[PDB]
Amino acid sequence: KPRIPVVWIHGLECTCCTESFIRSAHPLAKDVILSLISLDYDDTLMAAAGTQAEEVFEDIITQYNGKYILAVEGNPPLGEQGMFCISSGRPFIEKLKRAAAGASAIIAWGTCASWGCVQAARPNPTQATPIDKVITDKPIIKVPGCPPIPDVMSAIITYMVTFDRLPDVDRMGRPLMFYGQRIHDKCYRRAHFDAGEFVQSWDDDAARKGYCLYKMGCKGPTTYNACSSTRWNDGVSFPIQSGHGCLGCAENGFWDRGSFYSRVVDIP
Amino acid sequence: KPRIPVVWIHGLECTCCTESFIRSAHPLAKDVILSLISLDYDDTLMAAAGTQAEEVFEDIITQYNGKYILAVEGNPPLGEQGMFCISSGRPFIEKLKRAAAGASAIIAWGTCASWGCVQAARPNPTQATPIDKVITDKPIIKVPGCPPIPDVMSAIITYMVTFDRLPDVDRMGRPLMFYGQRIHDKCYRRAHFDAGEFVQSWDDDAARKGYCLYKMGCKGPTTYNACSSTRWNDGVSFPIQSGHGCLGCAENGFWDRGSFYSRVVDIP
Amino acid sequence: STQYETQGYTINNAGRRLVVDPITRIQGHMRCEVNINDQNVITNAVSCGTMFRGLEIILQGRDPRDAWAFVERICGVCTGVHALASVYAIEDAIGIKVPDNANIIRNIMLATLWCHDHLVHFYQLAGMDWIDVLDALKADPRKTSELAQSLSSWPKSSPGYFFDVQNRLKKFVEGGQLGIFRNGYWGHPQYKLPPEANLMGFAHYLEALDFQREIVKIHAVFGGKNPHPNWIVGGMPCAINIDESGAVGAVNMERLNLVQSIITRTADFINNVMIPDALAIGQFNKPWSEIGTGLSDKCVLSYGAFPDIANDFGEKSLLMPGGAVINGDFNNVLPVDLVDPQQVQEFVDHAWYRYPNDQVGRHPFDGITDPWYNPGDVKGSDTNIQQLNEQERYSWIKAPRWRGNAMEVGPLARTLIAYHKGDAATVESVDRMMSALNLPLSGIQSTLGRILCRAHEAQWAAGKLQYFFDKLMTNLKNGNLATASTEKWEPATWPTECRGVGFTEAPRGALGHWAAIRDGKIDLYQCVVPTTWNASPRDPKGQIGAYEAALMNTKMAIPEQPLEILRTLHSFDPCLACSTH
Amino acid sequence: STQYETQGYTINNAGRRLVVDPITRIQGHMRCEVNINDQNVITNAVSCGTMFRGLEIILQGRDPRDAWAFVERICGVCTGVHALASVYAIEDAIGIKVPDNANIIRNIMLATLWCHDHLVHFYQLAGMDWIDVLDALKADPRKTSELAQSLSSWPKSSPGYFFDVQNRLKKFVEGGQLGIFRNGYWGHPQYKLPPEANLMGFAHYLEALDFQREIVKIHAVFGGKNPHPNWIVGGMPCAINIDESGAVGAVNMERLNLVQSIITRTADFINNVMIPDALAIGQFNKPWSEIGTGLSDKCVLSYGAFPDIANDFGEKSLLMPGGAVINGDFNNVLPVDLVDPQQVQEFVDHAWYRYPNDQVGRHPFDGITDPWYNPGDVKGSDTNIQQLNEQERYSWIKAPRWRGNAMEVGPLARTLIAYHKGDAATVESVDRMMSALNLPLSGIQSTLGRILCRAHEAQWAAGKLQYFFDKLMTNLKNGNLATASTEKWEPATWPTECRGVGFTEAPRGALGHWAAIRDGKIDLYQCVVPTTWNASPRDPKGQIGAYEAALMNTKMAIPEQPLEILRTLHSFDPCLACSTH
Numbered sequence A, B: 001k002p003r004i005p006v007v008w009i010h011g012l013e014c015t016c017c018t019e020s021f022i023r024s025a026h027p028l029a030k031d032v033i034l035s036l037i038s039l040d041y042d043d044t045l046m047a048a049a050g051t052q053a054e055e056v057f058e059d060i061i062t063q064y065n066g067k068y069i070l071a072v073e074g075n076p077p078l079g080e081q082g083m084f085c086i087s088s089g090r091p092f093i094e095k096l097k098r099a100a101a102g103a104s105a106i107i108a109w110g111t112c113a114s115w116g117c118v119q120a121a122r123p124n125p126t127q128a129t130p131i132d133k134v135i136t137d138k139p140i141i142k143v144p145g146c147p148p149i150p151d152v153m154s155a156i157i158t159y160m161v162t163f164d165r166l167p168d169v170d171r172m173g174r175p176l177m178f179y180g181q182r183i184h185d186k187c188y189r190r191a192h193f194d195a196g197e198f199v200q201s202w203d204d205d206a207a208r209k210g211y212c213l214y215k216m217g218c219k220g221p222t223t224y225n226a227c228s229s230t231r232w233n234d235g236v237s238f239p240i241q242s243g244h245g246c247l248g249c250a251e252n253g254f255w256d257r258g259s260f261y262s263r264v265v266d267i268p
Numbered sequence C, D: 001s002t003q004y005e006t007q008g009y010t011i012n013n014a015g016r017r018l019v020v021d022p023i024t025r026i027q028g029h030m031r032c033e034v035n036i037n038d039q040n041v042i043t044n045a046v047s048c049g050t051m052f053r054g055l056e057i058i059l060q061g062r063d064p065r066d067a068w069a070f071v072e073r074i075c076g077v078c079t080g081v082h083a084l085a086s087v088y089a090i091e092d093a094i095g096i097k098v099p100d101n102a103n104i105i106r107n108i109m110l111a112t113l114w115c116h117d118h119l120v121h122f123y124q125l126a127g128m129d130w131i132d133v134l135d136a137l138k139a140d141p142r143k144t145s146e147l148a149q150s151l152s153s154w155p156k157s158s159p160g161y162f163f164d165v166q167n168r169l170k171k172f173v174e175g176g177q178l179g180i181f182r183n184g185y186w187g188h189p190q191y192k193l194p195p196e197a198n199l200m201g202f203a204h205y206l207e208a209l210d211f212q213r214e215i216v217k218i219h220a221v222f223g224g225k226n227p228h229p230n231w232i233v234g235g236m237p238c239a240i241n242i243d244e245s246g247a248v249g250a251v252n253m254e255r256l257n258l259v260q261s262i263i264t265r266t267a268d269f270i271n272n273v274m275i276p277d278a279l280a281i282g283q284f285n286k287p288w289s290e291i292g293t294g295l296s297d298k299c300v301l302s303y304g305a306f307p308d309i310a311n312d313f314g315e316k317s318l319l320m321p322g323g324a325v326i327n328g329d330f331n332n333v334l335p336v337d338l339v340d341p342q343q344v345q346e347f348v349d350h351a352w353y354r355y356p357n358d359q360v361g362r363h364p365f366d367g368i369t370d371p372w373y374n375p376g377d378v379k380g381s382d383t384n385i386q387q388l389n390e391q392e393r394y395s396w397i398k399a400p401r402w403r404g405n406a407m408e409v410g411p412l413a414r415t416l417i418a419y420h421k422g423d424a425a426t427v428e429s430v431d432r433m434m435s436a437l438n439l440p441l442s443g444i445q446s447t448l449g450r451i452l453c454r455a456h457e458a459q460w461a462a463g464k465l466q467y468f469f470d471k472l473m474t475n476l477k478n479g480n481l482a483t484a485s486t487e488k489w490e491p492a493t494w495p496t497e498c499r500g501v502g503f504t505e506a507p508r509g510a511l512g513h514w515a516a517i518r519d520g521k522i523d524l525y526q527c528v529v530p531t532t533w534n535a536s537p538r539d540p541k542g543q544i545g546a547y548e549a550a551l552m553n554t555k556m557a558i559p560e561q562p563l564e565i566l567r568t569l570h571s572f573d574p575c576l577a578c579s580t581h
């Protein structure tokens, strides 16, 4: 049977979200690409370059018009008429619009595509803009995080392939399965938070016993993600478990919510 | 370089502690046996049987008198003159005492060797007795759990080999590293406990959201172990994560502290 | 000294007495004694379970909902199977029906256990009876690679790999610290593999020791941990949530993806490593197709297992067939009823237990577990057994019988039952296997056959894992998420008095738990476990059990080195903690 | 059209223009244009970074303690290296000294990244320039097995394995959905491997894709997650507790055991998979030892990395040597000083930035990042470029120079510097590598040599991982547990005005972050990154950078199919997000 065509494009980005995807432990990215989907265009991995890659792009979006999924990593800049991100001599935003127009649905991978991420942090030199502010006529699933958890990315993919539908989402367009609860709602250090047992300076006695990182700036109380349950890199760790507070990386505007080392002010 | 000689004996037991040991992911049990220790006697795994096995036992304890580690799984029964557990036609207690006399230190693996475990639960038909009530003149490290976590077993082994010393212990002889804190002190469902958000019956809406299992009988509040942080089977899960309350399996007399589904009475 | 006749055997205790205590590479504590005649042939065999804990006694007065947790600790090798039987027994007593996903998950838990247990048995427990590990040091790595590559598509077969394995073994042995290989039977004339096959086998021993840890990740996802996962009366505790808020707190797509990954890897290992190794053992040890037949051509028993229709334990539901054959009549597979007091009964006239009349057998609903250590005259003392007295009481294992017949249980028994009920897949596999070895069908009824059937079963179970996982995913696609029924969770809903039977096929054979509940507590709990059948002592008619029968008539090359005894006993995969509980 | 002479090259933009946009199998956005003569030889090459984000602008006014997290997001491929440079720079500014274990752990983090990054580049980015994936379909699996076994001890080499990989590829392409292989250069005359080496290489591509996910588990232990682990100014946040209560909340023996397990597996994969594949590519493509030399026989630069003495960034401490060679004088390894305003300078006369005087270079402590998109007289228009005008501004990449010289950075550069400083392990390694290929030492200064040096560095980094782990364990054995210095954590303790430099060797080359702090906030933060050097546009003297030089004089078999351009560009492992930041 044919596999569902996917076109994966890249705007302004650091490529953390593609790297995360290839970290997937179950299913392996190899098995996603070979057996679950047809990854038909992806600048990071594809053999073809230049005119040959552009031919693939045109061939796929034409032959599979209305039938492919568009994955987007990064975001388009509006500054300098879009030429802060140039693709085939033209603004990236033109390629994004052309790709989006044929897609059945769009997956906005990562905080870049979802919200803006680091390039959108003050003063936003390029006027980097998240995908849902540019594309307003297509379903967009936001999968935030810098980057999102590898096995969350692959679980969302397998959900879609198995059930033949988009995941149910919250009001912000995030999949409820993995973004429905806060980090602090499933944190293993929550016993310490509720007892007032805090790390006060790095590598103090409290830190050596795994006390809560609230006073070190942890943004877990205001951040929706799966890191405290699913964890990272096939269950190995997550930020807090390795002794750093959550930065809030799955949240819109997290870079400009004050210092990472300032305490969260209005706990929900 | 010679590896440290280990003699592993088995009293009344189910073999869960040997099975746990071979589950170790890092180091692999293979590499422990091949590179870190000399596992010189072990009824479950050794080639020799009968008189050939007894010859190994006698040669090792004589040759390495004062220099081998004795690992003990299970426990001795005092009933019927010890003949509820017969080894080479004699009471197992006699073999335990002969092995113990030459050992530099003893590791009491699991709830059986530490406390008594299931055979010691009311009415204790065989008068199963933990190792520290029989052997009173050797260092005994208790590593409780039914069974202990595989990677805790191997971490304790690697600690001893690397640092050339026994681990520091609590007042009960348990390694502080893994048994210093309660399951409930590092439980990822603690946010829900603190909020009064409980599973009330199996597979209810609360269960489907991972709410706290305290009202379902979870003994995490009174149990010391590493399950909620280190987890089981290379970080895959632990009892609470998969939806069942902790039974209290690392605690002395857990089988006889009421029904597993009765709430913990006086939480610390 | 005496002789008598039973089941076609002449039991004769003249001649030299040989004792093997401890039996190693089993679970738990066993002693075996035999007598050999002047041709070094076994004329008497004595099977003795040398441990007891008393779980049937401990379970009295417990909450029925808690029972699975206690009985699961009968055994850490066949971990989970007793919990399954317990939840089945309690549900049968109370009248609880579980949801389909719970039944499917339970079947996944059992199939995972079959895969894990049979794999570890083949390599870590039985393997060194067949592979001469020290002989691996004489192998040519290039010829090892060529052999491996002729038997299997498995990737790991390079000459450099086999040289590295060999060099690791050389460095291990060089300083004298032979560990688990110390004082083995290496060089015995019954070791018939060439050096290259020994090296291949040893490499696979190491690969299986590593790999087995992955299989049980499936138990960790659904059951929290392994060994000794968690269960509930009413279904399973692992609530499912695929597409709603809070899926992070439940069995979600990421968890299910982990399970699929493990299933694929497990099938790959068993099909390409264990299966070819077993067939190769068969090819180089064909004479063992005629040794250790025992009761396998006379009487075999299976209860059946893996109900595919939730809460239906009938013949149309059970994927693994039940049935009994007696008197060597394989054309008439008989139906088994675990409630019928004339079928399963346990005798204790040769075991360390009290009954009011030890000449009669008790069905488990009338069972009694009252320990009585009384070895009689044993050429030593009560605390120094030099020779058991098999004319009197000689074991902590009770003697089960079916309609008065001594039965064999386990993979061979199940294979014979399925074959003779006309199961198509079994008939086809067995015929192809015996054809590939150029042996008659009757060759399966042997010590070699037990080993081959067990490997076959690991393959079958790895296939059924995918079948069950696909059934689960189909229910989830149809919106059916239920994992627990709680209508009768509360004791106020239960009958004041009721009783039930839970049964399945454990890795080693037919398992039954009989429970009676009164006033909300366990009034009676009796277990008859597969090794209880196989390692059974004698009954009031002098009939011998499966182990004793299989050892009868066996030639020993070197009486002092019991390799033939070990081979046959290990082929049954003895679990002594199970047997005595 | 114009012609001029620079660095021994004749730059001539007459003749046919070829454009490659996008360059694929790199990180980020790049455009390459070349002119070719009638002989299909490149006479002009133009390197253009086609993205900019402005991290240097974004960092203004932030807390210096936060800067690592922002700059880590310069790149997800070389993830962590910018954090390391950042903490170094802030520590240098403020005067913070970290504890030994924090330095050791940082060195572990860097080595881990070298291993992962180099591995993924070799297979997933560069590999399809050398391996003809569709030609793998024509291989004979048995001859593939024989080839693999002649090159390596790696276990996974059975004929059945190679047949299974071959059938997977066959099934993949059967439906006509060739995915990442669609419209590739397959069958191009520069593909020189035999079909069996193509199949072997393709199998390894797949094995590396799976394996790379394990390596970064080390980053997850110490840094929480990968990509983008966490760090702190003052050390690392991963507090250690081996033997006290609450070790479950810290880096404990089980966590350290995980790290050791990953180290061993990583070394094994690199040594027995990547290393022999790199040598095999070398054997079958020796003419590429004479193509793509560029600046590698003229000017090379390393800052040095891996300080073994905590807080000492001198020559006696750095395990990876620093130095610069110019004018092709490899007998004169010159010392580099990143504070000297006459050494590192960046030029923007041919880049999209404003300076007060674009004819002079600015040291990064005087750096300016004022973006100005002005492509001037292009063919096309400023939103639809058909040809850049390389006589004017043509890139988002600034042009760094060292004492006015254009330099090559990266694994070949480092190897040359280490070799010529007389590092024993580097001399032995390079000599044995070049001897195995029967090539002169000059053969390393080429596209093929960049690839070989990268594989060699992955092997070096894997050995260094064990060295650092063992140093950490030695400290723990001595009761030295400290991982953070916090006496200058609070802004009130810092100098009112200070500046610092943080440098290291990223996978792609010399990395520097220059930071100035005033009144507790970042006043200036300038990055010069390795791909900024290599992908540099021209300077006021018309000097070309490393990519443009390496492409000069290259013969193309088929002008419309840029395989030779891709081979040379991929050999540098371009990171365009890094280059522009």
Ligand code: SF4
Pocket (backbone or CB within 6 Å): A183, A184, A187, A188, A189, A190, A191, A193, A211, A212, A213, A214, A218, A219, A220, A221, A240, A245, A246
């Ligand atoms: S503040 Fe952070 S570390 Fe503390 S309990 Fe909440 S999420 Fe966990």
Ligand code: SF4
Pocket (backbone or CB within 6 Å): B183, B184, B185, B187, B188, B189, B190, B191, B193, B211, B212, B213, B214, B218, B219, B220, B221, B240, B245, B246
């Ligand atoms: S009662 Fe149990 S499930 Fe609830 S927070 Fe405590 S340990 Fe976790």
Ligand code: SF3
Pocket (backbone or CB within 6 Å): A013, A014, A015, A016, A017, A018, A073, A074, A109, A110, A111, A112, A113, A117, A118, A145, A146, A147, A148, D073, D076
């Ligand atoms: Fe993930 S490409 Fe990396 S910056 Fe934050 S998501 Fe973007």
Ligand code: SF3
Pocket (backbone or CB within 6 Å): B013, B014, B015, B016, B017, B018, B073, B074, B109, B110, B111, B112, B113, B117, B118, B145, B146, B147, B148, C073, C076
């Ligand atoms: Fe672990 S042998 Fe199993 S029963 Fe509880 S520890 Fe004992």
Ligand code: F3S
Pocket (backbone or CB within 6 Å): A145, A146, A183, A223, A224, A225, A227, A228, A238, A239, A240, A245, A246, A247, A248, A249, A250, D225
């Ligand atoms: S920083 Fe990001 S990775 Fe998770 S713990 Fe916080 S949302």
Ligand code: F3S
Pocket (backbone or CB within 6 Å): B145, B146, B183, B223, B224, B225, B227, B228, B238, B239, B240, B245, B246, B247, B248, B249, B250, C225
């Ligand atoms: S039952 Fe035991 S395994 Fe851990 S979670 Fe509780 S101590």
Ligand SMILES: [Cl-]
Pocket (backbone or CB within 6 Å): A008, A009, A010, A011, A043, A087
């Ligand atoms: Cl794109």
Ligand SMILES: [Cl-]
Pocket (backbone or CB within 6 Å): A111, A115, A116, A117, A118, A120, A251, A252, A253, A254, A255
């Ligand atoms: Cl954002």
Ligand SMILES: [Cl-]
Pocket (backbone or CB within 6 Å): A023, A024, A025, A149, A150, A151, A152, A231, A232, A233, A234, A235
């Ligand atoms: Cl992951």
Ligand SMILES: [Cl-]
Pocket (backbone or CB within 6 Å): B008, B009, B010, B011, B043, B087
């Ligand atoms: Cl023992």
Ligand SMILES: [Cl-]
Pocket (backbone or CB within 6 Å): B111, B115, B116, B117, B118, B120, B251, B252, B253, B254, B255
């Ligand atoms: Cl206990």
Ligand SMILES: [Cl-]
Pocket (backbone or CB within 6 Å): B023, B024, B025, B149, B150, B151, B152, B231, B232, B233, B234, B235
């Ligand atoms: Cl574990």
Ligand SMILES: [Mg+2]
Pocket (backbone or CB within 6 Å): C056, C398, C526, C527, C528, C529, C581
């Ligand atoms: Mg019984």
Ligand SMILES: [Mg+2]
Pocket (backbone or CB within 6 Å): D056, D398, D526, D527, D528, D529, D581
């Ligand atoms: Mg810069």
